[PDB]
Amino acid sequence: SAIENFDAHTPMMQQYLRLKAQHPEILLFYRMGDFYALFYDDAKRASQLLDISLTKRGASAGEPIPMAGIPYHAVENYLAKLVNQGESVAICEQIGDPATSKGPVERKVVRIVTPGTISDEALLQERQDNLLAAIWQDSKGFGYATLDISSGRFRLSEPADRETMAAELQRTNPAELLYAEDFAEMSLIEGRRGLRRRPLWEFEIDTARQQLNLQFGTRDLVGFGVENAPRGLCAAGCLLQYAKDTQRTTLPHIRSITMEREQDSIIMDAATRRNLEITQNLAGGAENTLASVLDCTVTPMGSRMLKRWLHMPVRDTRVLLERQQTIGALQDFTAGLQPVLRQVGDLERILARLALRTARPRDLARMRHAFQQLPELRAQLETVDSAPVQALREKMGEFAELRDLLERAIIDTPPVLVRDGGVIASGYNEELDEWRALADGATDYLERLEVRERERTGLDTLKVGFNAVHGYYIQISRGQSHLAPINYMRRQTLKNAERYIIPELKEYEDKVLTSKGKALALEKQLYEELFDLLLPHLEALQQSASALAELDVLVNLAERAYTLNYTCPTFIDKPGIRITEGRHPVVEQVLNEPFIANPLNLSPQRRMLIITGPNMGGKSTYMRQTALIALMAYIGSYVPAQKVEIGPIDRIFTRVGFMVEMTETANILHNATEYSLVLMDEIGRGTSTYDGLSLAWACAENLANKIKALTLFATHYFELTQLPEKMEGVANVHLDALEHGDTIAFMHSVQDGAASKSYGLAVAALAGVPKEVIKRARQKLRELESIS
Template sequence: MAGNTPMMRQYLEIKSRYPDAILFFRLGDFYEMFMDDAVVASRVLGLTLTSRNKNAEDEVPLCGIPYHSSQGYVARLIENGYKVAICEQVEDPREVKGLVKREVVRVVTPGLVLDGFNLQPKENNFLLALHKGDDQMGISCVDITTGEFRVLQCRDMDQARSELLSFDPREVLLDDGDRGEQVLSDLAPVLDGRLVNRLPEWIFEEDRARRLLQDFFSVSNLSGFGCDHLDTGICAAGAVLHYLQQTQLGDIGHLRALTPHSSNQYLVLDAATRRNLELTSTLQDGRKKGSLLGVMDRTVTAMGGRKLRHWISYPLTDCAAIWARLEAVDEARLRSDERERLRMALDGIYDLERLSAKVAMGSAGAKDLVALRTSLERLPQINDIVQGFEAPVLKEVAGDLDVLEDVAELIGRAIVDDPPFVLREGGLIRDGFDADLDELRVISREGKGWIARMEQQERERTGIGSLKVRFNKVFGYYIEVTKSHLSRVPEEYQRKQTLVNAERFITPELKEYENKVLGAEERIVSIEYDLFQEVRQQVALQGARLQNTAEALARLDVILALADLAHEADYVRPVVDDGTAIEIEDGRHPVVERVSPGERFVPNDVRLDTEDDQLLIITGPNMAGKSTFMRQVALITLMAHVGSFVPARSARIGRVDRIFTRVGASDNLASGQSTFMVEMTETANILNNATPRSLIILDEIGRGTSTFDGVSIAWAVAEFLHDNKRVAARTLFATHYHELAELAVTRERVKNYNVAVREWNDEVIFLRKIVKGSAGHSYGIQVARLAGIPAAVVERAKEILRNLESGEFSDEGQPRLARERKRSRPQASSPQLSLFSSGDQELRRRLEEVDVTVLTPLEALNILDDLKKML
């Protein structure tokens, strides 16, 4: 450092405190980056890389960006996984002799973006901390753009994985010890693509975390927040707060409470279920469009969009609370005129949650305050309409609405309608708001008139008709006279500048006026900035009122959106009760029917309970609609628990505590799990955690292994779900193993259903209707042909199928998979084909004794198992 300039020494000292961030170092109207930061930033941002001390041994790479357009550059760096430390000049350069003091005012990371291109309006931007305790997993997350600060505890890693997917954080904090390493390993697939920061273990210590949280909220304990008992969760919350205090060096007082998040209040959805049901994003491309949220989201505000996402991710389980939401949706649906007026009024409201957060943190500009004012001006109209509703939830919204007329009036009196983006150039404050400012503006405005009068006066006095009084930033005010009239210049004129064809002069009177006017303009800018900060601080003091009103508007927006959807899509109000029956008449898949408008959707009925119709075995060919049917039952059940109307003619939903799904096949190569291992792991989770209150969707169990193994596993799983009283969950079980239909004979609560099809000239026609009974065929070959499998392969498959269906062995003991052609008989010594050797008399005797016409599938499998053992 010794050989550097004072400014570079200042830069290096500040940079040493933020080694893992790109430092935006404020120099006048630019943010400059030096050395390695400059090299990285120039590459990522496409900036021209230049240098200080060119052609010297100590050449320093540098690049820069205009400070007033920094948001886009910061966003691109964040998107590429970098942190950015914003270093500002904290002194006015005009008032300081020597080096201006600079400090980092904020560190921007993916989880701590306040505004700009990295924020999605209808999605939270969470920073989340995970801490593994002895027998619990603590989680805490914060969204500094809205002020939400939550804490919870999970019983195991599976629940933590589910919560992580639900919160979908941009940034995750872990300790740098062994426990953090285990979390990182166990959750590797869901942490992929997120910025993970490892913090020292001491930051997660419980005693330290409690003291930090209590000091921040100015409380003696955390009981008032209802989370004092969440020891492991508090460790995570303490880490979150520590990280905020280290990176957000301004005020974070808009975090007003630590809210406990209890899974007992909500219908539990594990990670596989959230993924398989495509609740908020699709499996194919991860986008909102095509998901349940994509269909249901008719909210008109960003706050409402985030609230709806939360409701879908965390459906209720309390019947009274569900009923209250349904009652509000129903009233809003019936009162269409008021609903439309409210939606139109809400449509002009900006994101009050994020605006109030920016105000509280001192990052709001004048345009943000104007957006806040225009939003608040709509509240009286909204309040007048909402006061007329009767549903308890809407009455609660009306009670929580604060129209904030005083805040709107303050901003309206102080800030002009169209202020500039830059705060230190004036033009922010209205006339009439401050007397001193008005007086200075009069002086400044009269300057033009005074100049014009002086110019006319001097022309008359000197007789120089071309004399001009002008101003520029370099020389200030001056009198300009062409050289042809220099002989007429009065003695009191003082020469200031010589030009080719003219001379410029100054007079004592003009100099005095210059000092007065220029001083006024500088003071105007300074006073305006000070007044703006005062107004912003007064608005910040009303942060709690703003947050409460924003929360009420978000709830109102969601209720109106659900009512609009119910009206337009012909949804019905479900009955959600404490019974165990799920009875849906003419149910429809909420997404499929919307994304395929050209094809008439075929509705279906279903009845599930824990007494007579507990486990439905559903058979039928691929593409016939088994998966669509099962998913629509799960989605209708979930929508009812959200408090939404549902796509059906009628629906009675017995309360559900969890929805499980086992659908499809996928590898988890990152953790060394094959397709079949993933399938078995998900199945094990269901069998170990389901209750009679659960709803289970099983789509093909046992398909990732051999046929005999697969049938055996599927059969045993179905028996367990029926026979085990601890589980005995309402279950839809789709399978291509037709043998499972036999369960309905031996198990009283098992029922067979299939997807109806019709055959016509070797073609299969899917009727999409679920009917009683089991399917006779899988029609896999017909589906293969529809998929474009070559005709030769299709015909050969038919031949093999006929041989298999007529008997596995020929009279000579050869497999009937072979074509009808001469081929040498396998030798008895061949271990692979010894099953078909005609010399094996014991096997032949056993096979001849079997009467295949009376065998059940299970008995056939048992015989084959015995034969395997003999081999």
């Protein structure tokens, strides 16, 4: 509680506070000898989070300074505890030599670990992307950018309204979200993880243009298709600024940025994504999703690509025909290709570490093991006549020169780190073999000296050993210690042994340690040199990884189509969906009865189906599976049906029934087009009897007669089956059921026309409502049916 002016502090705390001032809201690991230290509330916080001791560094002038810390070699385990709780940590290191330093040794922050910029294998999940995003809002729209720092994939977009922006955050699921201080729609964003408020000036348009061109080495961003997009460039500017500030090295794997137009994909609202269960079931988990079914990729990078595709269907007809083509060609070849692709591993993330210069020995080894599969894949894919498959074979590369480089440079199975040597192999550098060979009197020399001195002295307890603190020694037991040569100079004393040193053992100590250190310092120069020779080829290597990943997805999708009995869909010119014996791709796996296949005929003249049928009749499944088939068709995949013809689809909307249901419904009515697939599931709620139904009725009318979209409209309201009569483009279908005394069977089959009756009382009876009460409700019911 003293006045903590600059002069009141020790030279050390002056330096620590300037560094902390650059990172005021986040934890600062501050290298001091063998320990990262934290101070003040960082220490206190660290103590709770990491479960380490909160103590004090003593102080002559005033208050003791709260302190905690960890040994430098245990850091990665502590970084993991933090990043999993969404915490950033600024890592500070000693740059200077203490012996040539008057005051405190020079200290820089060299890195900042944040949830969205982590690239180490230990902190990531193999099969999930981990993205950094930036968001900003004008009075008019949103800018959004994402970056996979462990792949270079750098994207820009401009969502026009609240609900697309929501859909975009849902889809990309950023691990860390940078946002502007003036952001108005905080409902999209509060209660997200890795939330990071930024000042407005980081989203300035001129600085982003300048920094992105600098990064890409371009004059303008014309070539990238984003010069057009200031809204998005602003968020991209911030993102890149934050990415540079965390890593504090060059980032040469970020060579490109791509715009994501609304026209290029099918925009699925937030409800659609949740209700289709693409990678997340409605109960939060990852089981019984569409990905649980379709995803038997064999590489991490492949699984991450497949999930991105599921999530972003493409509209380019050419790309889709190329994908389908590939899938049909490789059908026979999946048993041969999968085991081999598996061995390539996560080459994508390894190349990120190569680019960041963080790549460990076992990354280089696994890169080598990937290069070694290329020829078998090249040979396996030659046979396959498919122009798209050959284009991937070509992009996949070979890198025989680099494969040999790593085969000669690094041993078969190196250790986890370079810190303690034993990575570079014999023959690679002859100066190293000479330095290493001097540090191999460890075998012969020391032992011949033991024997020799034991026999010369006659003292049978005499041994030669080493310890790190006192060095090489000759040990005699305490019983015999008094008979040792008077030449033996004393070095270390123990309870029951005395240890000594002689000029010849000292001479050997001095050469083994100065040559072990020189063998390490050359080995680390040589290993950092491996980066120099690999890095020039990084562009080709990244293209290669993406080719293998694509190959893995497409090989998987081919194998899926065979095993799960799927067909190739075709595309038509105008809106419409014709399905023959289609199935819910997920429900038909997780369900131990037969799945009843069902057709669907949707067109511009038959654009709205009023779906009826009893509760648990199959109404929602029918809708979901329609959308899932649409989705699977539009990633390029074969589809769970006897046959599918499908027209263009711009957006998919879903409403699954307070103020929220009506607002959602309004967004649909405002943004759906003749090309949209609209799924309304028992909407329309009011405070009285017909209140809610009248809204649903007017809504349907607007969808049918003014919007002309392709709507599926499940209802409990039998009154809506009068709609086809009155309204062009509308028709009735129902889910079939059979009554037969005290019971009801759900047939799960779509028929044309309205249900003959509604089965609410039958469902009530099934649920256990007393027979006497159902007797009375049927009586009442007939009174009502007699009105008309």
